[PDB]
Write a protein that binds this ligand. Structure first.
Ligand code: HEM
Ligand code: HEM
Ligand code: HEM
Ligand code: HEM
Ligand SMILES: Cc1cc(N)nc(CCc2cncc([C@H](CN)Cc3cc(C)cc(N)n3)c2)c1
Ligand SMILES: Cc1cc(N)nc(CCc2cncc([C@H](CN)Cc3cc(C)cc(N)n3)c2)c1
Ligand SMILES: Cc1cc(N)nc(CCc2cncc([C@H](CN)Cc3cc(C)cc(N)n3)c2)c1
Ligand SMILES: Cc1cc(N)nc(CCc2cncc([C@H](CN)Cc3cc(C)cc(N)n3)c2)c1
Ligand SMILES: C[C@H](O)[C@H](O)[C@H]1CNc2nc(N)[nH]c(=O)c2N1
Ligand SMILES: C[C@H](O)[C@H](O)[C@H]1CNc2nc(N)[nH]c(=O)c2N1
Ligand SMILES: C[C@H](O)[C@H](O)[C@H]1CNc2nc(N)[nH]c(=O)c2N1
Ligand SMILES: C[C@H](O)[C@H](O)[C@H]1CNc2nc(N)[nH]c(=O)c2N1
Lengths: 413, 413, 413, 413
């Protein structure tokens, strides 16, 4: 049974059926609902409970293939059953893992970038062992993805959970993020969103360097142990200085940003197994840096200042000065990234492509999970076509769930 | 059960309890869910189930007063219970109404303009009997709200619902909307969302004027009977012609819009009762006209034209040429409404005043129902505090529901 | 002894030999130098001193012909001597007259229109005797030249002056002009520059209408007699109402002007004869009305008002507000004229057309008399080629001279 | 004898007597006429042709002081007479020079700045001895007058002409001026009026830089010797980059202009002495950059382009596009110089003051020598009072004369 949804802009309608295949988990605009969280545990998933899911994942994987693969399918099911019954858990083939990481992306309902899903570099780092080693893998990763400014998407997978006590985790939210500091006059220099995390880093040893853009160290957690700190060697963090193609004074704001956006603190779910260490990256969309990173009040908040030097009437709020200023900032980001041969995509182009993605999804697998709230751009929203797209939002499997900030639960062994 | 609600903008965090007294009706971004609709009926609501709700609301009414008048309260509940007795339904004092309209405004979650909820003008018209009287009651409503420039808000309540066979309802979307016509060569002229309806109007005998800004006539329904067209007198329609502070050429586009946004076809629910005609108006928000009306591909869609006219790089999408037009078009709208002294609200001031309201509502009733998707303005979203506010969405009584539009069910006499 | 003459704009460089013929009469920018006036006299030009000037002209006339008839040159030269000896004066042949009016035009150093000179209607009114009769020829001239808006150049020539005591003249500076009146409160209303003359008319019987554009009557003198008033029928007075093509409000200044510019008060000198009655007209140049008639402080003086009305910064001198208004008014004039199918020439075309003329003159007769001060338009001067053209000013024969205005010398019967 | 002259705008007339004192020298609109030029010579000015002129000046000087200085005056008259009897020439006191330069400024009849005359830095450089020494002096002068943007007027005076074989002159017509080059395909780059000169320096060994705004070298001539080239230190050449305050695109024209207008190539006459080296500067009038430098066909010629940039009907003349652009360019010039904090006066302000200057001169020496052709701005002429003022032109003494340009008449060592 089918659910009707309409693109009010084109009149085109899809019939969504893939929903009636969803894990059945209005908590309305909540950023991190419980429904999308996967907490810690501390005994391994009951093996009885894991079995049906593993058959289901094996079944998904095999029915992904061009011709039927009967022989090897039946083989794999038996194989997997025995493995769980005898060992409590199971291991997945090198391929299975590729397929899952790609599928879980495809299933991520907040990612506008999804047209790229079939195209994802998969770093199998499951046999990883000290934080020493986690750090090395993460560099192998950043080097590949930064690709001399021609960003590519890639994922690095650290060994499954077992226990719920021997977790491999990156504690940082993103691989590369700017520090933020509470200054003695009560003011915040740096990135206010990160005041808390940086404190943690300082507490754990890091020398606080008191600057607008200091890159915070990796906080790496091997086998559930206490975390250890590593600094990403600077020449692997690729950055872009902001300038504006018309306004000189832009350069004087002395603004820059990193090229590579990588989520680190999220957990991957596959046929019942959980990986709490999987950092993945794509490339940036204009507005993320422009609108958010630079104009959000709780991030860099450069909006007021720019209005002032565009000489706008920053006091009559009705003059739309704020909107003008946003747009200039956003041109500046794109322009800088282009003037520099560093991959980046504007929100219009993104949305356009997402519409094509959404189209083939319905055409090919009967559906497409999507968070409208997340997918419609932080700026000039109803000008993009996704704005007028009725969309359904649901949890499939494989899937990327958020977990609980690691420090919130860790026991300092 | 108290539910946590954060404003990632400031940090300020609300507790929410009000959700609990919501007779609890992911249908994600669906424009009109069945959840939010009030269908047609052919019998009157059963004695049995109409009484509990009748009581419910009288309760609300009284425990909202100066203090608490104890036996108007038992003598009003005496009244109602014995009123359902002898004709199985009931009346509301010329005054329980003033309350429930103001209350159901307070309760409509998509309205960003709810700081003004107590400042409403109630036009009692529940006695009214030809459609041609409906017409006059509406023109009172209009001349009043238009107020020669300075807009005030008003609702007009028509007779409730007996058999359902005898409904009083306006078929229009809003009172003032522009007609849309499908031209000989297949092209469209006017407001293209309204083609549909303009068509219907013509079939009911309206002479089409084949013009971009023609005001479509009222289609009116006297208790059940077929509908009759009455055109509004042209000088009860206040309109603003568009021009730009900086762009003399903007006039050349010859664009204008109406002063007054009113909603004809929603149904009010009050402690059990249903009123299928209750038009209500407020004043316009900048974007509704600037962004939405003018820029939407399925509306006037002038964006391409304005960018040619500002000579931007209208072929390189990533030049943000779209985002600039949209700003400039909106300054035009905002500026034109000041130049001709007509109440208008830019989307910032709206947002801010909403945030103040939302704060009040959580302070004084422990909850504020809000549909994030509708409240965040259609341009420059994240530059308005509401974007960063987590919100809960729920239906209370009294409430304004959408109906299936008359022409689709109404049995043709 | 040719004089070098450089056009700094082009670099092109003429050699003037025609100044050698100048009757050799720094009076820098004086509007009416003594040497361009022909005063009254009160005895005929002495037979003696006239004779050579008559021959003079005669050779110049015949030496003008393509052909060259020697025996007619002699026949004419003979007729003339034998005419001057016996009458004391001579008579021009009809044809000689055409030639002479045309030549004096060519010889008018202040007239940018000269490209047109070979092409000019000549009305012979030398046999005229009553003032009423003068008035008839004049309306013939006006209907002819007005030509339903397609203006044509023409001159009407009244009886030569005989003894200086029997002059036929028009006292009016121009055939069509608006009255200026001195109001009781100090202020002036109408054409301030014309208060003076208006007064005289009132004095001779005319009823003042106290209106901004009131057409003054004709003040006509027939051989010596006190002048008489006739009003040109409103039908022969073609006018144009100013509107601007972007500013509706322009029409609110209720401005108009007349289509026909005719100098009436000047004196033609041919071969020692003086005709002090000879009005001639051409078509208007934009700027004459736009810059001069409307913006001269001592004329209609509308400039400040057009300023306020356009919204410019009219107390900051440096804002160039004075210069923007003058451009817009000047457009209104051209626009208005086009709009009503009435010949008008803008000052740019005029400039260029003069340059083509000047150059032909240098080619064909070795010189071209030219008053730089009068020829360079009253706005955007250096933008016209005549500005960078070095010129010589000098008096040839025939020639149009200024006269001492009649009322200043006339003795009244 | 008195000479009456009218201001047609104001009605006001002066009578002029100062002209009787003019050393008695139509040479019509000639830029650089014989009568205002001052020959080279090869003998000293014969002593007793000098004498009457020396007494004359000495008389003027003492006559300038508020209270008769009888003794000191007589002393100086004999002083001088002796000096001439015995040396065949004379020196003038440091003070007399200060007085002369100012008087001669007052007497230069083409300078609308003259309102300032009483107010001039006078660099005595009469002791000067080499071309290098000349260069030294000229910098003192530029750093002084440039005065950090706040322009001040100054004159530097090099040693009087002796036998006029040992002249001291700067061959450059102005101090700072841009080179103009004739490019290989005959197009002209830079300042086309300046081509032939720039070629001269190229030939005296300047390395041509082939840009738009190349500052030319100084061509210096000491003691009649051949000249030598010096380049002004670039940081003494203050320039203004041009931007319109409404049109961003203006900045894209990439125009700038120097801040200091200094005339070198003129000769000072005082009491029969000739100074062939006296460079003077004042500050700019808007128009001479905006209208002339930027719009003359023979200059930077931008008009066509700005027209295109502005959407104007550059193909239909009568649209007055040309007039509209010349305005905006001019605004840009003033606005640029104002924002960059550099003295400039606009042509209305200029003219309004000349008018006060004139009116004082009449009040107080019975005259004011004025070239109307040069005084009336190259734009909106009629809109400035001077257009309407009849003015007399004549040569007093002291006086700044023009010279045969040095390269025409230099005996090449
Ligand atoms: C072609 C490259 C990609 C682009 C252009 C892109 C674009 C985006 C953007 C703009 C967001 C929202 C970011 C924000 O709100 O702060 C997002 C969210 C997300 N994307 Fe992507 N994406 C890309 C690749 C990926 C990849 C490779 C994965 C993992 C396989 C992924 C999974 C997600 C997830 C899980 C979110 C949720 C955001 C959160 O709460 O942190 N995306 N994507
Ligand atoms: C005080 C003036 C008012 C302002 C400024 C205002 C503002 C707005 C805005 C901007 C919208 C969204 C428009 C759209 O998306 O098409 C809206 C929708 C709405 N408002 Fe208001 N409002 C006002 C008065 C009222 C009143 C008097 C009522 C009823 C008593 C009301 C109930 C609603 C409802 C139910 C909607 C949803 C409309 C729909 O789905 O068609 N508002 N309001
Ligand atoms: C094609 C038609 C003509 C045009 C466009 C034209 C243009 C002009 C203009 C623009 C002026 C200056 C007006 C002012 O500043 O007051 C002028 C002055 C003059 N033109 Fe013409 N002209 C035309 C025909 C004639 C004719 C037919 C004659 C006589 C044969 C003539 C002789 C003069 C004279 C004598 C002046 C100086 C008049 C004065 O001081 O009032 N022009 N002309
Ligand atoms: C307040 C300062 C001054 C201003 C604003 C000013 C303004 C002007 C202007 C606009 C011109 C016409 C320039 C042109 O068409 O190229 C001019 C010409 C002239 N001014 Fe000045 N002036 C100033 C000071 C001086 C000084 C200090 C002198 C010499 C002492 C001077 C002597 C002249 C001379 C001789 C000319 C004739 C220009 C030529 O053909 O080279 N002015 N002045
Ligand atoms: C794969 C990828 C691609 C891309 N273009 N951008 C990204 C952005 C990742 C990111 C960076 N900085 C902040 C965020 C989000 C806030 N916008 C993370 C977040 C924060 C919070 C408080 C809740 C939540 N659910 N998610 C996400 C990831
Ligand atoms: C009371 C009031 C105030 C105000 N400022 N603006 C308005 C706008 C009313 C309006 C005008 N034009 C179109 C609409 C709605 C779209 N936003 C119509 C609509 C269409 C559909 C398919 C669903 C829906 N729920 N509503 C609403 C109403
Ligand atoms: C034949 C012709 C053509 C044309 N296009 N314009 C005209 C303008 C005639 C005109 C109209 N209004 C005033 C004037 C002149 C000043 N502009 C009159 C005049 C006045 C004074 C005080 C002195 C003088 N020499 N000339 C002339 C004539
Ligand atoms: C002291 C001073 C002040 C000021 N505001 N402007 C100036 C003008 C400097 C200047 C710059 N470029 C050209 C000129 C003159 C053109 N108006 C040059 C010139 C050329 C010719 C051929 C003749 C002539 N007499 N004068 C002058 C000087
Ligand atoms: C499909 C999607 O829900 C639809 O385009 C909605 C989105 N948000 C909106 N928000 C407001 N305020 N008004 C609207 O019409 C819409 N349209
Ligand atoms: C309250 C609300 O959920 C929150 O501010 C969200 C809204 N939508 C978003 N959408 C994206 N893509 N990224 C964000 O950070 C947010 N913030
Ligand atoms: C004083 C000066 O001669 C007078 O204002 C002149 C200037 N130049 C002119 N030039 C033309 N063509 N017409 C005029 O009236 C004038 N007026
Ligand atoms: C030919 C004419 O004299 C030449 O183009 C003059 C005109 N008037 C001028 N007036 C000023 N002030 N400066 C100039 O260069 C000129 N040029």
């Amino acid at each position: 049974r089918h659910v009707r949804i309409k693109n009010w802009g084109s009149g085109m309608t899809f019939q969504d059926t893939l929903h009636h295949k969803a894990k059945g988990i209005c908590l309305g605009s909540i950023m991190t609902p419980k429904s999308l969280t996967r907490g810690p545990r501390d005994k391994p998933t009951p093996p009885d409970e894991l079995l049906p899911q593993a058959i289901e994942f094996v079944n998904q994987y095999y029915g992904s293939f061009k011709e039927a693969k009967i022989e090897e399918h039946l083989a794999r099911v038996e194989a997997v059953t025995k493995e769980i019954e005898t060992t409590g858990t199971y291991q997945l083939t090198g391929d299975e893992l590729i397929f899952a990481t790609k599928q879980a992306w495809r299933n991520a309902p907040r990612c506008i970038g999804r047209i790229q899903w079939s195209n994802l570099q998969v770093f199998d780092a499951r046999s990883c062992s000290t934080a020493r080693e986690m750090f090395e893998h993460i560099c192998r990763h950043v080097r590949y993805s930064t690709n001399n400014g021609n960003i590519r998407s890639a994922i690095t997978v650290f060994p499954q959970r077992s226990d719920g006590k021997h977790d491999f985790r990156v504690w940082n939210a993103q691989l590369i993020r700017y520090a933020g500091y509470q200054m003695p006059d009560g003011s915040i220099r740096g990135d206010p969103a990160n005041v808390e995390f940086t404190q943690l880093c300082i507490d754990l040893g890091w020398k606080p360097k008191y600057g607008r853009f200091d890159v915070v160290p990796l906080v790496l957690q091997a086998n559930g142990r206490d975390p250890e700190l590593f600094e990403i060697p600077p020449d692997l963090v690729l950055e872009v200085a902001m300038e504006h193609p018309k306004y000189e004074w832009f350069r004087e704001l002395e603004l820059k940003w990193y090229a590579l956006p990588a989520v680190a603190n999220m957990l991957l779910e596959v046929g019942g197994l959980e990986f709490p260490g999987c950092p993945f990256n794509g490339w940036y969309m204009g507005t993320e840096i422009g609108v958010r990173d630079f104009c959000d009040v709780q991030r860099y908040n450069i909006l007021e200042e720019v209005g002032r030097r565009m000489g706008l009437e920053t006091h009559k709020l009705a003059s739309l000065w704020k909107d003008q200023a946003v747009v200039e900032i956003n041109i500046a980001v794109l322009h800088s990234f282009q003037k520099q041969n560093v991959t980046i995509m504007d929100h219009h182009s993104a949305a356009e492509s997402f519409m094509k993605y959404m189209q083939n999804e319905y055409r090919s697998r009967g559906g497409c999970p999507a968070d409208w709230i997340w997918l419609v751009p932080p700026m000039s929203g109803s000008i993009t076509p996704v704005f007028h797209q009725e969309m359904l939002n649901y949890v499939l499997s494989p899937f990327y769930y958020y977990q609980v900030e690691a420090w919130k639960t860790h026991v300092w062994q």
